Design a protein around this ligand. Structure first.
Ligand SMILES: Nc1nc(=O)c2c([nH]1)NC[C@@H](CNc1ccc(C(=O)N[C@@H](CCC(=O)O)C(=O)O)cc1)N2C=O
Ligand SMILES: Nc1nc(=O)c2c([nH]1)NC[C@@H](CNc1ccc(C(=O)N[C@@H](CCC(=O)O)C(=O)O)cc1)N2C=O
Ligand SMILES: Cc1cn([C@H]2C[C@H](O)[C@@H](COP(=O)(O)OP(=O)(O)O)O2)c(=O)[nH]c1=O
Ligand SMILES: Cc1cn([C@H]2C[C@H](O)[C@@H](COP(=O)(O)OP(=O)(O)O)O2)c(=O)[nH]c1=O
Ligand SMILES: [Cl-]
Ligand SMILES: [Cl-]
Ligand SMILES: [Cl-]
Ligand SMILES: [Cl-]
Ligand SMILES: [Cl-]
Ligand SMILES: [Cl-]
Ligand SMILES: [Cl-]
Lengths: 274, 273
């Protein structure tokens, strides 16, 4: 019977827009609490700030320890950074939106790992939180394409959009506790940790054009880093069906022309191109 | 035309059985020549020797240099070990059966690479040889499952069986030169070289059970090697859907019980040897 009905924990446009949605449609400000990620400085930047939205709309900021004992609270992680232990919570209403098509690509850097592993599609998945990393039972999933020249950043913005949508699609059944779920399968399950990914990726050119292009574009996310080829930052990679011969590599003022062991043209655009 | 009509280059039961098939159904011995792989000494083992079958059936052994100038020769690579350059040959009738579902898994160790990269299926592909590594246009393909507990060796034996079948399915149209082919796509194309694969694999246990299982069984091919956990060789991995808790690892006299970050039970059976 507590005042507080729901907690939004996490960051970025998905957390802010989902919070705004529930404030507009389901709960009053005094029924909601927020746990921003540790790094949230309260500044709207290339993403909206959850801390800023809470402060601007009179939504209380809390810690996990403040909400553990709240009976029946709905806890939603939307890019939240702390692993929870479910036995801390009195409530069993604990949910996450994970930026992959589970069971594939559990873990981190999920705007990098599907592209680096040659996928043509990804997804967002709403699931129950259990004590493992993105291992809980799936409630809903939406799969969508990774277009051939999408960068990690382009994929991330698609996760924000489709994740916000799957939140809205499912929130009423979460609130009325009538949702259905299904155990994740063992097969196809994959996982990457921060140690598995070197963000300063050294490209293996003894690979197909599709693999070289994926090795480039998986690391294009300018707020964090850009790939460097021959001491030049790369902002875009374009893969064509044109055969140009095997193992081409040529540097120009504004781009590189590259092909791998199957000979298909890649244009890797330098950041300095006007 | 020249006496010689066809060259079978390569090894193992796919080469021997495809050569037997064409000797029975199409060609006389004098019309066929063979190029065995470098290490074939004419002794059958866990696969038949191509060199031995040729000698036993009065088929001549040749080098590539001896066939370049033979007009209209059919050249067929069946696990052959040398990259050819097509402009050496007068003939454009140059074909390979590659042990993967192209365009995926160009290159080598293709009983290892699909498993290691978490595939549920593989295939055999008949294609024209061009100057790149498994890059030429596809003539036919047969895909098939990698069962959940199959090892690299099990996969290899399936390539030999399905590869022999796709050879028999297509040989008449190759002989008649009526076959059809299609360029490979750029998307999905992948490639592994010998440098990419360390055959003494160190397992990463901070992975899912399906990934740990695949890391083990991708290297089980006893005639070459077996993967080693705590100085025991593993002969079989078994992945179940039973949840046993996250990140289990326990060693027993005859097996290990392992789970990864998602908690599904693996039994890694030690070689009884
Ligand atoms: N129990 C739980 N399950 C989840 O699926 C989940 C939560 N909590 N809390 C919110 C969010 C947190 N997700 C994560 C994912 C990875 C790390 C992390 O620190 N990974 C380390 C390895 C940690 C380890 O090995 O124990 C790394 O280096 O990658 C932290 C939080 N989340 C779902 O999104
Ligand atoms: N031109 C050509 N294309 C082919 O697709 C083909 C042939 N020849 N000849 C028969 C067979 C030979 N396949 C191969 C495949 C890889 C290596 C090899 O030596 N790979 C080295 C890398 C070589 C390099 O980078 O140039 C390695 O270390 O992996 C040799 C023969 N074959 C299709 O089967
Ligand atoms: C932290 C970081 C993220 N990214 C990108 C790729 C990630 O999928 C995306 C979101 O990362 P983020 O959610 O901040 O990290 P995590 O995956 O550890 O929870 O930002 C980088 O490219 N480089 C980085 O250094
Ligand atoms: C040479 C080698 C092969 N193999 C297995 C996996 C290979 O897919 C299969 C056949 O290899 P093989 O055709 O001899 O070598 P390549 O791929 O270089 O042409 O045998 C091993 O497991 N270990 C080895 O050392
Ligand atoms: Cl906290
Ligand atoms: Cl669950
Ligand atoms: Cl699933
Ligand atoms: Cl040659
Ligand atoms: Cl030469
Ligand atoms: Cl071709
Ligand atoms: Cl194709």
């Amino acid at each position: 019977g507590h005042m507080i009905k729901i907690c939004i924990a996490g960051k970025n446009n998905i957390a802010v827009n989902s919070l705004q949605f529930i404030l507009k449609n389901y709960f009053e400000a005094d029924q909601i609490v927020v746990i921003p990620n540790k790094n949230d400085k309260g500044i709207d930047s290339w993403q909206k700030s959850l801390l800023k939205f809470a402060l601007d709309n009179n939504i209380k900021i809390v810690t996990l320890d403040e909400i553990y004992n709240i009976e029946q609270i709905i806890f939603f992680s939307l890019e939240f950074d702390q692993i929870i232990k479910i036995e801390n919570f009195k409530s069993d209403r604990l949910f996450n939106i994970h930026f992959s098509a589970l069971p594939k690509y559990k873990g981190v850097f999920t705007s990098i790992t599907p592209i680096l592993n040659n996928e043509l599609e990804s997804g967002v998945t709403l699931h129950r939180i259990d004590n493992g990393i993105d291992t809980g039972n799936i409630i809903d999933q939406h799969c969508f394409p990774i277009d051939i020249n999408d960068t990690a950043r382009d994929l991330y913005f698609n996760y924000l959009k489709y994740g916000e949508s799957i939140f809205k699609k499912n929130i009423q059944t979460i609130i009325n506790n009538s949702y259905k779920d299904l155990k994740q399968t063992n097969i196809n399950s994959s996982y990457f940790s921060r140690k598995d990914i070197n963000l300063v990726h050294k490209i293996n050119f003894k690979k197909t054009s599709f693999e070289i292009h994926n090795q480039i574009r998986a690391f294009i996310f300018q707020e964090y880093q850009l790939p460097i080829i021959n001491n030049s930052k790369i902002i875009k990679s374009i893969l064509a069906n044109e055969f140009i011969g095997y193992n081409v590599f040529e540097e120009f003022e504004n781009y590189f022309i590259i092909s791998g062991i199957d000979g298909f043209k890649i244009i890797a655009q330098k950041l300095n191109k006007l």
